[PDB]
Design an enzyme around this catalytic site. Structure first.
Site, short mmCIF file in Angstrom:
data_model
loop_
_atom_site.label_atom_id
_atom_site.label_comp_id
_atom_site.label_asym_id
_atom_site.label_seq_id
_atom_site.Cartn_x
_atom_site.Cartn_y
_atom_site.Cartn_z
N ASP A 146 0.81 -1.22 0.00
CA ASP A 146 0.00 0.00 0.00
C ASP A 146 0.86 1.29 0.00
OD1 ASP A 146 -2.45 1.22 -0.38
OD2 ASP A 146 -3.30 0.67 1.59
N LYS A 148 1.66 4.65 -1.08
CA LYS A 148 0.89 5.79 -1.56
C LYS A 148 1.28 7.04 -0.77
CE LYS A 148 -3.41 4.58 0.91
NZ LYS A 148 -4.88 4.67 0.74
#
Ligand SMILES: CN1CCC(n2cc(Nc3nc(OC4(C)CC4)c4nc(-c5cnn(C)c5)ccc4n3)cn2)CC1
Ligand SMILES: CN1CCC(n2cc(Nc3nc(OC4(C)CC4)c4nc(-c5cnn(C)c5)ccc4n3)cn2)CC1
Ligand SMILES: CN1CCC(n2cc(Nc3nc(OC4(C)CC4)c4nc(-c5cnn(C)c5)ccc4n3)cn2)CC1
Ligand SMILES: CN1CCC(n2cc(Nc3nc(OC4(C)CC4)c4nc(-c5cnn(C)c5)ccc4n3)cn2)CC1
Length: 288
Positions: A146, A148
């Site tokens: 993840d 980001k």
């Protein structure tokens, strides 16, 4: 490393009963996700961030809370967030971290709450710092899953610190496909578990640093920021068209040098992508 086991009411005290009003207003709420609410606190005469987990089953949420702790117990680095403690209690899950004076990369790129725009020099250091944090996780045989801009937090010096390890995996296929869709590698959306996917996601983070645009904007052509890569290759648009206009120190040579790193990270073929060690080497060669 060992974490402090907090009581929900002993955390309700430092956050003024989890005051859902914004910081500017006089509350304790400083932001939200994905999957809960980050709250401001003060304990041991130090400022802390308390994330209150919100229920996407509660049994699967508990697993991510556990994964978070497991990874945070093993992994500790300069370019990684540090876990302070947690609250287990009766259906009340909270994680405690050190307060990041400059919040998230997502928020500093959008200048949320009137923060000044980040200079190209600050942006190169944030990209180098983040790649160092991904390097530590890949060297310690972990896949974040993840990567980001909302998970790249910043301290007072703008030191990039990777966060949210609730989905991280050791070192493949899976039935349960997870991550952020605007940042996922084509193979990751297909169920593959490879640290080559983390590189693709970092490539999106780099296009966000160059452009100051979000990864996904439903009211935009193209909707996914990763698609601007094709528009540039097709000579439909140039890198100059996309460079964040909220900078005065962005030289055309080093912007295109960072775009080249992002473009390579964003290869459709996981194997034709550079490893985090090559990424770090290219980002270092960019500030020369
Ligand atoms: C629903 N859930 C709520 C919370 C609840 N709970 C966890 C603790 N404390 C704790 N738990 C660990 O285990 C895991 C991550 C939960 C599974 C743990 N693990 C390590 C470790 C060291 N090396 N590795 C690879 C891992 C170090 C310290 C730890 N401390 C207290 N309550 C568990 C169940
Ligand atoms: C209702 N529930 C309340 C809370 C209760 N609970 C307590 C813990 N504490 C815990 N658990 C560990 O378990 C594993 C193995 C990580 C999962 C653990 N492990 C290590 C360790 C060091 N090397 N390795 C390989 C592991 C160190 C410390 C640890 N502490 C977790 N849950 C459960 C029941
Ligand atoms: C409602 N409930 C509230 C909470 C209360 N409760 C407290 C604990 N504390 C605990 N539990 C561990 O392990 C088990 C039982 C989860 C598996 C554990 N494990 C290790 C360890 C170190 N190395 N490894 C491999 C494991 C270290 C410390 C630990 N502390 C468990 N339940 C019971 C009743
Ligand atoms: C004008 N100014 C308004 C205030 C502003 N600002 C500073 C923070 N500090 C902060 N914020 C976090 O969360 C976000 C960005 C709100 C969502 C955060 N999160 C974690 C964490 C680590 N893992 N997990 C799962 C969460 C650790 C530390 C943190 N520190 C927030 N806003 C700066 C600019």
């Amino acid at each position: 490393t060992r974490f402090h086991s907090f009581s929900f009411y002993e955390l309700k005290n430092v956050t003024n009963n989890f005051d859902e009003r914004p910081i500017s207003v006089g509350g304790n709420k400083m932001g939200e996700g994905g999957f809960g609410v980050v709250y401001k606190g003060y304990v041991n005469n130090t400022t802390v961030a308390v994330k209150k987990l919100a229920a996407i089953t509660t049994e699967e949420l508990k697993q991510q809370f556990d994964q978070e702790i497991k990874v945070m117990a093993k992994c500790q680095h300069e370019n990684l967030v540090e876990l302070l403690g947690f609250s287990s209690d009766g259906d009340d899950l909270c994680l405690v971290y050190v307060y990041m004076p400059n919040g998230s990369l997502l928020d500093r790129l959008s200048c949320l709450d009137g923060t000044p725009p980040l200079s190209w020099h600050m942006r190169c250091k944030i990209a180098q710092g983040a790649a160092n944090g991904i390097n530590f996780l890949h060297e310690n045989h972990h896949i974040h899953r993840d990567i980001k801009s909302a998970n790249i937090l910043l301290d007072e010096a703008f030191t990039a610190k990777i966060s949210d390890f609730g989905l991280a995996r050791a070192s493949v296929m899976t039935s349960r496909i997870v991550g952020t869709t605007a940042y996922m590698a084509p193979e990751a959306l297909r169920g593959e578990i490879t640290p080559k996917s983390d590189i693709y996601s970092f490539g999106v983070v780099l296009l966000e640093i160059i452009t100051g645009l979000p990864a996904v904007d439903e009211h935009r052509e193209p909707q996914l920021l990763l698609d601007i890569k094709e528009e540039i290759e097709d000579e439909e648009k140039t890198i100059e068209d996309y460079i964040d206009k909220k900078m005065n120190d962005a030289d055309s040579t080093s912007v295109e040098a960072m775009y080249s790193v992002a473009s390579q990270c964003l290869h459709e073929k996981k194997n034709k992508r550079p490893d985090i060690k090559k990424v770090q080497q290219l980002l270092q060669e960019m500030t020369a």
